[PDB]
Assembly symmetry: D2
Homo-oligomer: 114 residues x 4
Amino acid sequence: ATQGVFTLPANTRFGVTAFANSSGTQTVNVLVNNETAATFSGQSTNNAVIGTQVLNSGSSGKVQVQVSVNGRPSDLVSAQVILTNELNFALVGSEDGTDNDYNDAVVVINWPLG
Amino acid sequence: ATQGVFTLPANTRFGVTAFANSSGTQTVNVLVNNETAATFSGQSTNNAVIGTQVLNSGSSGKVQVQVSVNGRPSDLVSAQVILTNELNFALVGSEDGTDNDYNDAVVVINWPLG
Amino acid sequence: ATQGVFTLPANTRFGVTAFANSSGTQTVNVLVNNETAATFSGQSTNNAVIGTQVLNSGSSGKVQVQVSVNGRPSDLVSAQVILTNELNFALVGSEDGTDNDYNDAVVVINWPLG
Amino acid sequence: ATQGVFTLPANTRFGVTAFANSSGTQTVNVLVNNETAATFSGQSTNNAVIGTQVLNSGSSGKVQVQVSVNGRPSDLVSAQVILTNELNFALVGSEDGTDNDYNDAVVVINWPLG
Ligand SMILES: OC[C@@H]1O[C@@H](O)[C@@H](O)[C@H](O)[C@@H]1O
Ligand SMILES: OC[C@@H]1O[C@@H](O)[C@@H](O)[C@H](O)[C@@H]1O
Ligand SMILES: OC[C@@H]1O[C@@H](O)[C@@H](O)[C@H](O)[C@@H]1O
Ligand SMILES: OC[C@@H]1O[C@@H](O)[C@@H](O)[C@H](O)[C@@H]1O
Ligand SMILES: [Ca+2]
Ligand SMILES: [Ca+2]
Ligand SMILES: [Ca+2]
Ligand SMILES: [Ca+2]
Ligand SMILES: [Ca+2]
Ligand SMILES: [Ca+2]
Ligand SMILES: [Ca+2]
Ligand SMILES: [Ca+2]
């Protein structure tokens, strides 16, 4: 199934934050309505916050996360969770190798903000 | 129901990261085996990262997140989500006021690292 | 924070299923737009499906689960999960006593159907 | 990533319940320690419960859900979510066709019981 794609509330600010846990340099791309809106990169095996940004979900609300290492797309796993019918997290894990820890880049999207 | 309390695997490193979305200064305290292991403070209405750290869950694996604003305990919501039977997120929202957006401090705990 | 309340898409069929795990007879009420739309009762300590029903979320999409044991409301915990940006689960646990297993009545709401 | 595989605490009773939403007859196999422990089958486009059972997670705790329709495995999506650090849901959706509703067989595993 498709992973890393989320329908957010339209026209709404959200946070997107990426963590790295791999020997490989991660590159995380965040697309809003199919166009790159943010790119984060770094290399850490200790959960460094390689990027954090506030974006607007735009007219369609479509947000997609893509991860690559040295130009190779990582395999993604994702889900969205909603607490108290209001607080949202869209969660992404990714695997760049063979150990299947799925933490090589971890991406958390949160809304609402403010 | 109790919120913000998670049982991690014993002796395991985990990330903890806090974001703020409120007029009030947030104080986030992270307890491991009932003792304070990290404390973050800050104020933002734009999802600023007010702290990030790597901790070890110790022999008990018990991790607790508490949030207060000017000494007043915030009401918490929480859950844990596991993707592909491997990647764990323990998620906390908190409310310091009347609007019930539950994002006043948002805390993300993730493991495994590395 | 409020628990057991979910906003579904309007005029949408959903499934609701209740399980019991307690010495006490569980009564599960499912409200749509603040009116009872399904009720299930029973006693099991082995996860009996005390009822399952297909309901329509109607014009408001407001669905609320309430649980009681001989008139006494149980304490609720809930969340919603979305898989592949499409498949929705609204989850409820409840506690009727002191052990905090929160499985005394468990309720799962799922959509879309068909 | 692998989907439909969950590690439960060892030697723990769990419930498993399957629902159908498709023109096709669903076959759901539940493995414990890599051997079939339960098999459900049925056909419904209205979320009928096609099987429910209580099982033991056994010495390894490894539980796997497989779904087959019209002679081929369906594509699976899954996650585990834990409420109040106590109540566990392991959730599976599956797609037997092209519409990508992922509800064709829906499987809910819950623990602890009793
Ligand atoms: O050296 C650390 C390792 O780097 C890559 O191989 C990762 O895929 C692996 O999970 C681990 O983080
Ligand atoms: O000024 C911004 C506001 O600050 C506090 O009142 C918050 O509880 C509220 O959700 C909002 O963030
Ligand atoms: O007798 C079994 C017990 O019945 C009630 O006390 C429940 O609250 C408890 O969790 C347990 O299921
Ligand atoms: O309308 C019946 C249909 O049966 C199969 O095609 C399913 O894959 C589809 O989602 C739908 O349920
Ligand atoms: Ca890896
Ligand atoms: Ca890694
Ligand atoms: Ca607030
Ligand atoms: Ca706020
Ligand atoms: Ca109980
Ligand atoms: Ca019980
Ligand atoms: Ca389908
Ligand atoms: Ca279907």
